[PDB]
Every structure is written in structure tokens, then in C-alpha cells.
Ligand binder design. Structure first.
Ligand SMILES: [Mg+2]
Ligand SMILES: [Mg+2]
Ligand SMILES: [Mg+2]
Ligand SMILES: [Mg+2]
Ligand SMILES: [Mg+2]
Ligand SMILES: [Mg+2]
Ligand SMILES: [Mg+2]
Ligand SMILES: [Mg+2]
Ligand SMILES: [Mg+2]
Ligand SMILES: [Mg+2]
Ligand SMILES: [Mg+2]
Ligand SMILES: [Mg+2]
Ligand SMILES: [Mg+2]
Ligand SMILES: [Mg+2]
Ligand SMILES: [Mg+2]
Ligand SMILES: [Mg+2]
Ligand SMILES: [Mg+2]
Ligand SMILES: [Mg+2]
Ligand SMILES: [Mg+2]
Ligand SMILES: [Mg+2]
Ligand SMILES: [Mg+2]
Ligand SMILES: [Mg+2]
Ligand SMILES: [Mg+2]
Ligand SMILES: [Mg+2]
Ligand SMILES: [Mg+2]
Ligand SMILES: [Mg+2]
Ligand SMILES: [Mg+2]
Ligand SMILES: [Mg+2]
Ligand SMILES: [Mg+2]
Ligand SMILES: [Mg+2]
Ligand SMILES: [Mg+2]
Ligand SMILES: [Mg+2]
Ligand SMILES: [Mg+2]
Ligand SMILES: [Mg+2]
Ligand SMILES: [Mg+2]
Ligand SMILES: [Mg+2]
Ligand SMILES: [Mg+2]
Ligand SMILES: [Mg+2]
Ligand SMILES: [Mg+2]
Ligand SMILES: [Mg+2]
Ligand SMILES: [Mg+2]
Ligand SMILES: [Mg+2]
Ligand SMILES: [Mg+2]
Ligand SMILES: [Mg+2]
Ligand SMILES: [Mg+2]
Ligand SMILES: [Mg+2]
Ligand SMILES: [Mg+2]
Ligand SMILES: [Mg+2]
Ligand SMILES: [Zn+2]
Lengths: 252, 91, 77, 135, 112
RNA sequence: UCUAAGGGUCGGGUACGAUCAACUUAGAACUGGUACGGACAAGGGGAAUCUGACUGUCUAAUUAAAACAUAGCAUUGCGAUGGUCAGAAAGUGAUGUUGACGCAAU
RNA sequence: GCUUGUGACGGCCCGUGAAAAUCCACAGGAAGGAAUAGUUUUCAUGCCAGGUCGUACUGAUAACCGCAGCAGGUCUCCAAG
RNA sequence: GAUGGGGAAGCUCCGUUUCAAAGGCCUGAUUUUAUGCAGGCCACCAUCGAAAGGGAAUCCGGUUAAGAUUCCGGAACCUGGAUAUGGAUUCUUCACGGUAACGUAACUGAAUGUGGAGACGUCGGCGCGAGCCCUGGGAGGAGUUAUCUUUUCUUCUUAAC
């Protein structure tokens, strides 16, 4: 048989990200002396649109504590931050929207974005437009800080991990209907060649597990096991349940 | 003279895409093209471009906001719940 | 490629070391709405620029012709 | 208190001497045929003395501490009145309305203001009027 | 009714291949390629086309005298003279308030 | 072959005058073998049933369609020591200049 | 009026619409610099030099690809009444 | 797509700043003398890849059987290397003038840093430029003229800098 579509993507020829116009990589500052003993001041020189990205970016320039020079970082714009604002970054730093603080140093209920998984990875969690994490407690011995991630998951990370106070700008973007193919076209045009999607049930069997038949149908259960092998996994991979989710969601 | 009975700005799509989709768009589209009051300079010159980004005509300030409206209700309460928590660390 | 009117500066150009050749041009034109007059153009060829002095006064022209340095090649007309 | 008077130091906020410190010597608080606006005759500092160190020696110090002054009519709205102040007696009779108009009179005037300033810098009276504003 | 042709191999209408039509002393029409238009320099502080400064293409600023590339006040060919007015007042006021900040918290240390 | 309406430009003590230049539109007479968008140019319309919402896409060289796509709807996987995917292997690689308002799979 | 150029604006975006070479400016003040005479080549003028390869013509119902001087195919500028 | 490297029996595969001791400029030191060392920087880390992207600088007239923005003529411009005379500047050494926007023939400026230009979608109407189109008077040439037409056609141009 043929090699099915989801298998071709890993080679990354026509499926690599459409990257030319991107502003750069959004990252917290390097976790240097200033940030983990005191705090450092910067000015958001500009907040700007990143192509293919939901949320606007915030260009925030600092002084270099070791050489006479300006060094600029690329933050994700937390909603409310503006051109000309002073951003503070450090262990001892005020709990104001836009500043970046180690998770250990904010009370419970704090709402932060771009938070680090391990301390120093310059921003892992809560980056897409409209997302955030909430701190739900602390364990001062071992200095963990229990947080809740946008999925609902409740991970526990180091209290040294850094997050930026507030939520990420550009929320509600997904409440507007795309309304027509072209909008989705220009959407994925600046992300990657994932659109449009021929259904595996409209191809011949060479092409897909779902292919063929004199009527258009899946033919066997579309729930595929985790242990399935490449070229088998298409449909509902490892589905622990299926069907229209009725009743209240919201993890207990 | 009143030109259209309900479609308003949404009349450009005409009959296509279904009344309800058009209705939802018309809301956010009206939300997103509008002129807003500027916090800094007290004029109503904030307008959007590039969802998330809101800059003021004069006074040249640019604020990060919601995708089709300046302030989003979420970030609004987050402002206050941070205001509340902050005050717990001085008094 | 340059125009000149300072008759003093002009003679200073005509004796500038690099200047070896010049030329006088005689044109017949009219005077302000009516009769004709005789315009002369003194063109001094410098090593990188051609200076030309327009002397509309016919009398100022003749006096300025003999004023020319004797060691200067001066193509007539 | 009416403060733009004959002693107050100010910063020139527009023009070529923008950012440099001055002293009012004689205020024309309201109008002039020539200058129909609130203006002040001020002597200022154009090229400040360069910072001097112990490593600086015999004739380097004498060179480093030379001062280039200037004299200017200046609208009030282009001055920033400072809290400090500096005495004006050594060149009261020099920085005048008559002083401008005749370049020669401005040239001599600057000489008086120059020596009166360089003496003031040594034995560092006012110590701040002689410290370049950085911006 | 007289038509014209490019004067360089490049046959397409690219921005580096702009054309002007011109009437010559021969009494005929002939194209003449036009360099791309220059843009004005900009205040790094505010962003306006900072006045006083001549507007050329960047390599041409090396064939022009310094007076065309500056104005006499501080931050001449760099900032727009209202930003200079501002970075003056801001500088002076901050240095003043900075003095206020010290002796206030010096008296704090003497009475607390 | 006529009528009417629609403009510009210059002095006025601290109502108008004078002059120059444009096809538009409407109305009225006269006139012809009743003809006149005179060639050229230039929509047939209506009432229904089936079917795909629509614009869009494909069997180059017998199939353009009701087929594919699409927006919308719904389900599934995954918090990076990860999901899906590539490779003989690797201090290898795609998604990823990414982080659940995300990526991947139906 | 027509073609093109350009300006100040306005509409649109879950699309907000390259990069590097190169050139200039400013901040800075290291340093060097005159009275019996210095500093000045971003002002003017003057001196020398600028290599290597392409450059014909066709560009199509006959100069290209379609076994060919094939009714096919093959990127584009100028454009009168 | 090389390179310290890491795979692979191996042809070779992977990585491109990548777990690498990765390199070169300004001038001072010399008066054996030519370039050793005395400073201080830069840690930027190959290279290939556009005859439509970016980009130093030229025009008009004339000329050939066949070449021309390339020859001829005349008039420029850029870049690099030399440089000297004139102007400017200084005894208040490193220009003055304007309230200001800013003005100018000039009007010293190393390291370092910073700003700008290169450098950017699309459509719409509105404003202006150019070349074209239309047209009046005149000064010429041509056509028609049984009759009509102060008519029909045509010349009246001005490059870079
Ligand atoms: Mg297979
Ligand atoms: Mg990539
Ligand atoms: Mg595709
Ligand atoms: Mg589909
Ligand atoms: Mg699908
Ligand atoms: Mg099929
Ligand atoms: Mg199969
Ligand atoms: Mg199966
Ligand atoms: Mg099947
Ligand atoms: Mg089915
Ligand atoms: Mg200076
Ligand atoms: Mg050619
Ligand atoms: Mg200037
Ligand atoms: Mg100028
Ligand atoms: Mg009329
Ligand atoms: Mg009239
Ligand atoms: Mg029919
Ligand atoms: Mg259809
Ligand atoms: Mg077919
Ligand atoms: Mg077949
Ligand atoms: Mg069809
Ligand atoms: Mg067919
Ligand atoms: Mg439905
Ligand atoms: Mg290994
Ligand atoms: Mg065109
Ligand atoms: Mg834009
Ligand atoms: Mg510049
Ligand atoms: Mg020069
Ligand atoms: Mg060579
Ligand atoms: Mg040829
Ligand atoms: Mg032929
Ligand atoms: Mg053929
Ligand atoms: Mg004609
Ligand atoms: Mg390789
Ligand atoms: Mg190359
Ligand atoms: Mg090229
Ligand atoms: Mg090019
Ligand atoms: Mg020729
Ligand atoms: Mg020949
Ligand atoms: Mg030829
Ligand atoms: Mg020649
Ligand atoms: Mg010549
Ligand atoms: Mg030169
Ligand atoms: Mg001067
Ligand atoms: Mg630069
Ligand atoms: Mg730029
Ligand atoms: Mg470009
Ligand atoms: Mg030219
Ligand atoms: Zn404002």
C-alpha cells in the first residue's frame, strides 16, 4: 500500500513551518544574577504582531549589566501592557501586570503567563492568545508551587520558575467564525501546509485505512490503540471514550 | 435614510454563510472597528489593527488588548484580582 | 556646466593654471519686446567645468574681449 | 514668587544651546519692540570644562578647564527655571540690550563672561552650573 | 503615437526598472530609467520625518557636505527637537527628584 | 432647428459689474415610404421535482458531476522526561521562530 | 480625457504584507592642536587611475520546444484618431 | 554546503555554530631594522545561492553594409589613490547667525554605543506631475481646387548634469 498522509509529515518537506515573517522567538530574559537576586527594569519599546501567531509580541529592551549596551528581548504581550511601560523582572519585584516573577514569590490566586516548566527554560506554559496559569498553592520546603494549566491539568513546578503577571493579549480570537474558506486559507498560509484536509474515507485504500468501499464508511472501529503502529494510527487514537460529551465538563 | 433593517455592516456578505454566522460576526466586527477612549490622553482615538494591538491616533500609545475589543472581561477581573493580591503584600 | 556673472571672478578663471582654451559665442536676440541686440557668451573650459559668462551689453563685450589673457586659445564663433 | 529675575539659573530648552545651563542677568519680563515676548538676557556655557583627574598634569588641567561661554536673548517659554542660582555682578554692565547688535560688542562681552566664569570654576563655586546636563 | 523601449536588458516592470518618457533635442521620445525615489530620514525617538535634513538614497549621503546631514542643536540629524525638548526636561526633573529622594530617606534613617 | 438649468477668474469704504472656458441633463418645434442601440455590439423568460448550501477543486488525452474541498458542528490524543510523525544508525530530524485561544488525528 | 508617476487620506485582515551588503547621523570625549603663528581636506579648485567576461541577430503561423519553415506551446515593456 | 566532531562494514549519513584552544583591525613601539612586541578592543565563526529582489556612478547629437547609454563629438558623474594653492577657523583655540522651527561654502573628534536610510501588502476615491490626446494665432513646405473650403496634411524640438 501507499504511505498515508500523517506519515509523510514527519519528513518535513512541504510541512515545515512557514517562518519567513516571524518576529523572532518569544522568550523570558536569561535567568541571570539580577533576576534571581533582585530585579531589573526595562521598557517595552513596542508591541507588535507576530505572523501566524494569535497573540501580539512585546519588544522589551534592558540594559546589559555587564557591558555598556542595550539588549532587547521578545516577550508575549500580556493584556494591558503598553508602549513605554516599565517592566520589572526579578525575585524581589512588584506584583504588577507585565512583570516577571518567580512562582514562589507571588501569592496564591496570581494569574501569570509564559511560565517556565523548569526554571530558566525562558517560557513554556500559557503562551497562546487568551491563556494563563493560576497558582493554587505552595510547599515552601522543596519550594514547589502548584499551578493549574489552561488544559485544566494541575502541574507542580519549582518556585524559582518564572511567570509574567497577567493574561495574554488577543483573547476571544476564536469566537469569530472564519465564515469562509479563504479566511482559513490565509490563516494556515502563514502557519504550515495542514489545510485543506481530504478525508481518509474519500481516498482509495492504498492511501488510508479508511479508503475504499462501494459506500463511504470507516469499515471498522475508528478507535486505534496506543500500541498501534505507524500507518495504523488514524482516527481516534487511544480514545478512552467517544461520542457527544453531554453533561458538565470541568475537572473535579 | 435607514439602509438595512438588521444586517448593518454585515450586509457585505449578502445572503451567504447563514444568518446566524453573520449575526455572530456582525457583533465582533462592530466590536473591532470601533473608536475607543484612550486611558492615557483622554480622547477616543484608540483603534485596532492586527487583533490584540490597540494604538491611539494622537499620543501614539499602543496597548495590548483582546482580539476584537480593547479590554476583555477576563483580563478585566484579572486586573482587579491582581490589584487585590498586590495590596495583601503592603498592608 | 556652470554659469557665471562676476566679471572679476571670470578673469580670475581665465588665468587659472588649468585653463588653456576658451570660446566666444555670438547670438542675435531681441530686447524685452522689440528690436534686436547682440548677446555674447564667454565660455571658459576648466579642467572639470565649462564656465560661461553672458554679457548682453555689446559695449561690455568688446572691452572684455581684449581683456582676455594673451596666452589663451580663444575659438572665435 | 516672581522667579525669572536677575539671578535664577535655567536650562535652555530650545535652540542651538538646548540642554545647556544659563543665568538670567536682566529680565525683560514683558515685551520688546524687537522681541514681542517674555524673554531674558542670559549668559550661558557653551563648551563645559572637561572633568579633571589627579592623573591630569601641569598644562593639561589648564587646558581641560577652559570654558567657552555664550550670550543670548531667549524667550521665557524656552527656559526651565532652576532652583539654584548664581551671582551676576561681575558682568551685569556687560550683558546688556546694547551688548547685542555690533558683533564686536558680543565678542568682548563673551571675554568678560569667560574670565568671570573660569575664575568661578576654580574654587568651585556653584559646582553644578559647571557640570554638563546629560540627556 | 510614438512608442518607446527599455534601454536595459531587464524586460520586466520591477521597482528597479522604473521608466520616464522624455523629449530630447533630436525631437523624438526616448525612455530614461529612473532611480527609485528616496525617503526622508526619521526621528529615532518619535518617528517623524525629521526636518532640516536632506533626503537622498543612503550611498548618496557620502557625496554631500555635513550641513545637509545635521542641524545645529544637540542631537541634530538624530532626534526631532521636540523629543530633545522632552529628554531635556525629563533629564533635569529626574536628576532633581533624585536629590529629593535621597535626603528624604536620609531623614527617614534618622527618625524611624 | 431651437429653449432652459448646471461653472471659473479678477477690483468693491475699515446689490451688481467685467471677462474666459467646458459636454451634461431635461423640455419644444420641424422633418422622412413609421424609420432611428439602423452595421458593430447585445440576457430568452416562467412554474416545479431531485441534488450539492454558496465562491472554489479533480480524472492533461472519452467522466466537471450529486464526486473533493470549504465554513459551521462533533469526537480524539498530548503539559515537553510529551503527543503525532521521519531515520540503518546517531551528540539525527518534522510539528517548533511552537505551548492547549496550541499542535496532531478522525 | 488617456497612459504612467506620485502625494495626503480612507477600506480590509484569526492575512498586518523579506533579508543582508552598504551609506550616513548622533551620543560619547580618547586624543591632538596657535601668536610670532598653528589646526584644518565632510568648502572651492587642481593630479592620476578604473581591470576581467557578455554586447551580432531571432524571440516566433520559419532563427526556441514540439522528428519539420508543424493552424499547438512558450515570461514581459511601449501603445494614435 | 565544507569544518572540530557524532553515526555507518563502507560508498558515505548527520550537525552549521553545531559539547571545538576556531580568528584580525587599529596604531603604538623602531631610528641595529625590519616588523619582533608593548596597549586596547571584536568573539563577528566558512562558503555557494537572484543577468526580475537589494545595488556607487552618463547624457544628448552624430556615425556602420553589419556595432553602440560601449565608437566619434560635446557636456557630466562615481569610486580609489595621491595631493597642493585659495577660502574657512584660532590670541575667547576647535564657526557664527535666529526667541524658535532652523540657517550656511567651510566650521577637528579615537574606542564604544545608539538612531536612520537600505526596507517593502492591497484596493478606493480625491490632489498634482510628466508623456500622449485635442485646439487658437503666426512663420514655412505639401495636397485639393468644374464648383465650395482665410481649407486639408505637415515642421515649429531642447538630455544627463
Ligand atoms: Mg509502503
Ligand atoms: Mg524550519
Ligand atoms: Mg495545501
Ligand atoms: Mg474534509
Ligand atoms: Mg477532517
Ligand atoms: Mg474515490
Ligand atoms: Mg490498507
Ligand atoms: Mg484497520
Ligand atoms: Mg472504507
Ligand atoms: Mg459516510
Ligand atoms: Mg559636542
Ligand atoms: Mg537592449
Ligand atoms: Mg541642515
Ligand atoms: Mg538643507
Ligand atoms: Mg448657459
Ligand atoms: Mg458669466
Ligand atoms: Mg429554459
Ligand atoms: Mg456545488
Ligand atoms: Mg478527462
Ligand atoms: Mg489514465
Ligand atoms: Mg463545472
Ligand atoms: Mg470533459
Ligand atoms: Mg448543520
Ligand atoms: Mg551518539
Ligand atoms: Mg501597467
Ligand atoms: Mg501597515
Ligand atoms: Mg541618514
Ligand atoms: Mg572633498
Ligand atoms: Mg584588485
Ligand atoms: Mg543589439
Ligand atoms: Mg522571423
Ligand atoms: Mg508553429
Ligand atoms: Mg498628431
Ligand atoms: Mg554536510
Ligand atoms: Mg554570492
Ligand atoms: Mg542582481
Ligand atoms: Mg537586482
Ligand atoms: Mg544615437
Ligand atoms: Mg563600424
Ligand atoms: Mg541593430
Ligand atoms: Mg565619449
Ligand atoms: Mg572632455
Ligand atoms: Mg576623490
Ligand atoms: Mg563662517
Ligand atoms: Mg548601523
Ligand atoms: Mg530599519
Ligand atoms: Mg524589497
Ligand atoms: Mg543620471
Ligand atoms: Zn492617547
Amino acid at each position: 500500500g501507499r504511505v498515508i498522509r500523517n506519515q509523510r509529515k514527519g519528513a518535513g518537506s512541504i510541512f515545515t513551518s512557514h517562518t519567513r515573517l516571524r518576529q523572532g522567538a518569544a522568550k523570558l530574559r536569561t535567568l541571570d544574577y539580577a533576576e534571581r537576586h533582585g530585579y531589573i527594569r526595562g521598557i517595552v519599546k513596542q508591541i507588535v504582531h507576530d505572523s501566524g501567531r494569535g497573540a501580539p509580541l512585546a519588544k522589551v529592551v534592558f540594559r546589559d549589566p555587564y557591558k555598556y549596551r542595550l539588549r532587547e528581548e521578545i516577550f508575549i504581550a500580556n493584556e494591558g501592557v503598553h508602549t513605554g511601560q516599565f517592566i520589572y523582572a526579578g525575585k524581589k519585584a512588584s506584583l504588577n501586570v507585565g512583570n516577571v516573577l518567580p512562582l514562589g514569590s507571588v501569592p496564591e490566586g496570581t494569574i501569570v503567563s509564559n511560565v517556565e516548566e523548569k526554571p530558566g527554560d525562558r517560557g513554556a506554559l500559557a503562551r497562546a492568545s487568551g491563556n494563563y496559569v493560576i497558582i493554587i498553592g505552595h510547599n515552601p520546603d522543596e519550594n514547589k508551587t502548584r499551578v493549574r494549566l489552561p488544559s485544566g491539568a494541575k502541574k507542580v513546578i519549582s518556585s524559582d520558575a518564572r511567570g509574567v503577571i497577567g493574561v495574554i493579549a488577543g483573547g476571544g480570537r476564536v469566537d469569530k467564525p472564519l465564515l469562509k474558506a479563504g479566511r482559513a486559507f490565509h490563516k494556515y498560509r502563514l502557519k504550515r501546509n495542514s489545510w485543506p484536509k481530504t478525508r481518509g474515507v474519500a481516498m482509495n485504500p492504498v492511501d488510508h485505512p479508511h479508503g475504499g468501499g462501494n459506500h463511504q464508511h470507516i469499515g471498522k472501529a475508528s478507535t486505534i490503540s496506543r500500541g498501534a503502529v505507524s500507518g495504523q494510527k488514524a482516527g481516534l487514537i487511544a480514545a478512552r471514550r467517544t461520542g457527544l460529551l453531554r453533561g458538565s465538563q470541568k475537572t473535579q | 435614510a435607514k439602509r438595512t433593517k438588521k444586517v448593518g455592516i454585515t450586509g457585505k456578505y449578502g445572503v451567504r454563510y447563514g444568518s446566524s454566522l453573520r449575526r455572530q460576526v456582525k457583533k465582533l466586527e462592530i466590536q473591532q472597528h470601533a473608536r475607543y477612549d484612550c486611558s492615557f490622553c483622554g480622547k477616543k482615538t484608540v483603534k485596532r489593527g492586527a487583533a490584540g494591538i490597540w494604538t491611539c491616533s494622537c499620543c501614539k500609545k499602543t496597548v495590548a488588548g483582546g482580539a476584537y475589543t480593547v479590554s476583555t472581561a477576563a483580563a478585566a477581573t484579572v486586573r482587579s484580582t491582581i490589584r487585590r493580591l498586590r495590596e495583601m503584600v503592603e498592608a | 556646466a556652470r554659469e557665471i556673472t562676476d566679471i572679476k571672478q571670470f578673469l580670475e578663471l581665465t588665468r587659472r593654471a588649468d585653463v588653456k582654451t576658451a570660446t566666444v559665442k555670438i547670438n542675435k536676440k531681441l530686447n524685452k519686446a522689440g528690436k534686436p541686440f547682440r548677446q555674447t557668451k564667454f565660455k571658459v573650459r576648466g579642467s572639470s567645468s565649462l564656465y560661461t559668462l553672458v554679457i548682453n551689453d555689446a559695449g561690455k563685450a568688446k572691452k572684455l574681449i581684449q581683456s582676455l589673457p594673451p596666452t589663451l586659445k580663444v575659438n572665435r564663433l | 514668587a516672581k522667579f525669572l529675575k536677575a539671578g535664577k539659573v535655567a536650562v535652555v530648552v530650545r535652540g542651538r544651546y538646548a540642554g545647556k545651563k544659563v543665568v538670567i542677568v536682566k529680565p525683560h519680563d514683558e515685551g520688546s519692540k524687537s522681541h514681542p515676548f517674555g524673554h531674558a538676557l542670559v549668559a550661558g556655557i557653551e563648551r563645559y570644562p572637561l572633568k579633571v583627574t589627579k592623573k591630569h598634569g601641569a598644562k593639561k588641567v589648564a587646558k581641560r578647564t577652559k570654558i567657552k561661554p555664550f550670550i543670548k536673548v531667549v524667550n521665557y517659554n524656552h527656559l526651565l527655571p532652576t532652583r539654584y542660582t548664581l551671582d551676576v555682578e561681575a558682568f551685569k554692565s556687560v550683558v546688556s540690550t546694547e551688548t547685542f547688535e555690533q558683533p564686536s560688542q558680543r565678542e568682548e562681552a563673551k571675554k568678560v563672561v569667560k574670565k568671570a566664569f573660569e575664575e568661578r570654576h576654580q574654587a568651585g563655586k556653584n559646582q553644578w552650573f559647571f557640570s554638563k546636563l546629560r540627556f | 503615437a510614438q512608442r518607446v523601449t527599455f534601454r536595459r536588458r531587464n524586460p520586466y516592470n520591477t521597482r528597479s526598472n522604473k521608466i520616464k518618457v522624455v523629449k530630447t533635442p533630436g525631437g523624438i521620445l526616448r525612455a530614461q530609467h529612473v532611480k527609485k525615489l528616496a525617503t526622508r530620514p526619521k526621528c529615532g525617538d518619535c518617528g517623524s520625518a525629521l526636518q532640516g535634513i536632506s533626503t537622498l538614497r543612503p550611498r548618496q549621503y557620502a557625496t554631500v557636505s555635513k550641513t545637509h546631514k545635521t542641524v545645529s542643536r544637540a542631537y541634530g540629524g538624530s532626534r526631532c527637537a521636540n523629543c530633545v525638548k522632552e529628554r531635556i526636561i525629563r533629564a533635569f526633573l529626574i536628576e532633581e527628584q533624585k536629590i529629593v529622594k535621597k535626603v528624604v530617606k536620609e531623614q527617614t534613617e534618622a527618625a524611624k
